[PDB]
Design an enzyme around this catalytic site. Structure first.
Site, PDB file in Angstrom:
ATOM      1  N   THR A 291       0.824  -1.188   0.000  1.00  0.00           N
ATOM      2  CA  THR A 291       0.000   0.000   0.000  1.00  0.00           C
ATOM      3  C   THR A 291       0.861   1.241   0.000  1.00  0.00           C
ATOM      4  O   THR A 291       2.062   1.184   0.312  1.00  0.00           O
ATOM      5  CB  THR A 291      -0.952   0.015   1.191  1.00  0.00           C
ATOM      6  OG1 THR A 291      -0.289  -0.515   2.354  1.00  0.00           O
ATOM      7  CG2 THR A 291      -2.130  -0.928   0.921  1.00  0.00           C
ATOM      8  N   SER A 292       0.245   2.361  -0.370  1.00  0.00           N
ATOM      9  CA  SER A 292       0.957   3.624  -0.415  1.00  0.00           C
ATOM     10  C   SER A 292       1.107   4.214   0.993  1.00  0.00           C
ATOM     11  O   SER A 292       0.257   4.026   1.881  1.00  0.00           O
ATOM     12  CB  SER A 292       0.300   4.595  -1.401  1.00  0.00           C
ATOM     13  OG  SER A 292      -1.058   4.766  -1.102  1.00  0.00           O
TER      14      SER A 292
ATOM     15  N   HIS B 150       8.479   1.078   3.407  1.00  0.00           N
ATOM     16  CA  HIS B 150       8.136  -0.195   4.040  1.00  0.00           C
ATOM     17  C   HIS B 150       9.450  -0.928   4.278  1.00  0.00           C
ATOM     18  O   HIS B 150      10.424  -0.693   3.569  1.00  0.00           O
ATOM     19  CB  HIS B 150       7.252  -1.096   3.153  1.00  0.00           C
ATOM     20  CG  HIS B 150       5.897  -0.539   2.856  1.00  0.00           C
ATOM     21  ND1 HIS B 150       4.953  -0.304   3.833  1.00  0.00           N
ATOM     22  CD2 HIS B 150       5.322  -0.176   1.682  1.00  0.00           C
ATOM     23  CE1 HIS B 150       3.860   0.188   3.278  1.00  0.00           C
ATOM     24  NE2 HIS B 150       4.062   0.282   1.975  1.00  0.00           N
ATOM     25  N   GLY B 151       9.458  -1.829   5.255  1.00  0.00           N
ATOM     26  CA  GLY B 151      10.609  -2.659   5.512  1.00  0.00           C
ATOM     27  C   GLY B 151      10.322  -3.987   6.171  1.00  0.00           C
ATOM     28  O   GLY B 151       9.177  -4.365   6.423  1.00  0.00           O
TER      29      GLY B 151
ATOM     30  N   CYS C 150       9.373  -0.602   9.058  1.00  0.00           N
ATOM     31  CA  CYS C 150       9.101  -1.783   9.833  1.00  0.00           C
ATOM     32  C   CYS C 150      10.323  -2.683   9.851  1.00  0.00           C
ATOM     33  O   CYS C 150      11.119  -2.679   8.933  1.00  0.00           O
ATOM     34  CB  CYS C 150       7.952  -2.524   9.166  1.00  0.00           C
ATOM     35  SG  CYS C 150       6.669  -1.521   8.754  1.00  0.00           S
TER      36      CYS C 150
END
Lengths: 235, 233
Positions: free
Chosen positions: B29-30, B88-89, B130
Site C-alpha cells: 500500500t501507499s 516499508h521494511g 518496519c
C-alpha cells in the site's frame, strides 16, 4: 529528569555467565583466556557496587533457568540489572555448554511486563560472543511504556562478525570495557563510556596469526540502546 | 581526540529516500503522509547546514544506483554523511517501489574501505521502516571498516513502526523535534536518547479494534561510532 534514578539502596545484580568448556558433541574449542575476563568483570562491577554472581560452564537449560530465577527475584530495592555473557555464538545466539540459546529467550524474561520490579529501570546485557564469521580487514589511516524499553545490549562486535579473544589478557572488548569503566564510571554517561570502549577496541587492537587469513584483523563493538534515559553510575 | 572533527568546509550530504507509491506487483500500500516526514527532515537537516538531496519513489535498482554514485563522490571537504530511509521494511531490508533491498547492501557502499574520503567520519543512517510485524503491548507506569557507522532505527528488531498520516511518523516527528531543540546543546547519542523517551512516553496507538489499540513503540540506537558527535563548533 533526563537520567535514571541510580540511588536505590542497591545498584543491582550482575550475573556473569562464563563459558569455557563445551561438550564433545558441539565440537567447539575451549575458550582460552575467558577466566581473565570473568575476574576482571567481577572486580569492576564490585567496585561499581553491583551484587556480582559468577556462573561457570552452564548448559543451555541451565542458562534459561538461571535467567528465569533471577527474573523472578524482587528488584524493588535495585537501581538496575546487569548480565554478562561470555561464550561462543552466532547472530542472535549464545552457546551454553551443550548448544545454542536464543538471546531473545534470555532477554524476554526481563521484558517490562515479565519483570515488574525492573520496569523503567535500565536492563544491561553485555555480550562477548561471535555474531558470525565475517572478519574485518580494516583500512589504513593509522502512563505506559513499551515492554522493549530500558534495554541496552552492548555487543563485542558488529552483526555478522567474529569476536576476538586474546589468550593472555582476555577478550579485546571486555578488556576495554573494564579499563574504561574503572577510568570513567565516576565521570561520564554510559553511552559515552561505551563509545570510548568502541575507540579503544577499534584502534588499539589488531589480531596476530601465522595464517594470513586470520592476520591483521580489526574489530568494532556495537552498542544497542533502547534506553530512555541518561545512565550514570555515580550520584 | 574525544569528539569527531565537525569543522570541515562542509557538514555533508543528507540524502533522503522517500517512497510513497509502490508498484502493483508489490501488493504494497501507499505510505500516506510520508511527505510530511521528508519535508520535516529537509528543514531540520538544512538548518544543521547539510546539503540536502531529496529523492521520491525510487526502485530498488534506483536506490542501489543512487547510493553507489553518492559513495563515489569526493567527501574530502565534508565532515559527515547522512542518509534517511522512509519506506516499508522488514528486518534488515527496506523497500524500493518495486521490491526489497538488503540494508547491508546500501551501507556497504560507504564501508571505510569502499568510500575512502569518508574514512574516519560519522556515517549516519536513519531508518523509518518496519523491522517485522510485532506490536508492543506496553506496560503499566588502521581502523575497522565497519567503524564510524550509526543506525537510528524507528523500532526494535522484529517490530512494526507506527506512523500518523497527518502528523508524521512517531520516530521522525520526535527526531526532528529533538534535533531542533538540542543539536546546539547535546551530543548526538543523548539527543537520540531523548528521542527514545519521547516516542516511548508520548505516543500510543488508537484503534477501534483491540488488536491494534493502545500499542507502544521504542526506537533503537545502533552505534559503532568511536567518538562523540556534536553538530556545532
Amino acid at each position: 529528569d533526563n537520567s535514571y534514578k541510580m540511588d536505590y539502596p542497591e545498584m543491582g545484580l550482575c550475573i556473569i555467565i562464563n563459558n569455557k568448556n563445551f561438550h564433545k558433541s558441539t565440537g567447539m574449542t575451549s575458550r582460552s583466556g575467558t577466566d581473565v575476563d570473568a575476574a576482571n568483570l567481577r572486580e569492576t562491577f564490585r567496585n561499581l557496587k553491583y551484587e556480582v554472581r559468577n556462573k561457570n560452564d552452564l548448559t543451555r537449560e541451565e542458562i534459561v533457568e538461571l535467567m528465569r530465577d533471577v527474573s523472578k527475584e524482587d528488584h524493588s530495592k535495585r537501581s538496575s540489572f546487569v548480565c554478562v555473557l561470555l561464550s561462543h555464538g552466532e547472530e542472535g545466539i549464545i552457546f551454553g555448554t551443550n548448544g545454542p540459546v536464543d538471546l531473545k529467550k534470555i532477554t524476554n524474561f526481563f521484558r517490562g511486563d515479565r519483570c515488574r520490579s525492573l520496569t523503567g529501570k535500565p536492563k544491561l546485557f553485555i555480550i562477548q560472543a561471535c555474531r558470525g564469521t565475517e572478519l574485518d580487514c580494516g583500512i589504513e589511516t593509522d502512563h505506559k511504556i513499551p515492554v522493549d524499553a530500558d534495554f541496552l545490549y552492548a555487543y563485542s562486535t558488529a552483526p555478522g562478525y567474529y569476536s576476538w579473544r586474546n589468550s593472555k589478557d582476555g577478550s579485546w572488548f571486555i578488556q576495554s570495557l573494564c579499563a574504561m569503566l574503572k577510568q570513567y564510571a565516576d565521570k561520564l554517561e554510559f553511552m559515552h563510556i561505551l563509545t570510548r570502549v568502541n575507540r579503544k577496541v577499534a584502534t588499539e587492537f589488531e589480531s596476530f596469526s601465522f595464517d594470513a587469513t586470520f592476520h591483521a584483523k580489526k574489530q568494532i563493538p556495537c552498542i544497542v540502546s533502547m534506553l530512555t534515559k541518561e545512565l550514570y553510575f555515580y550520584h
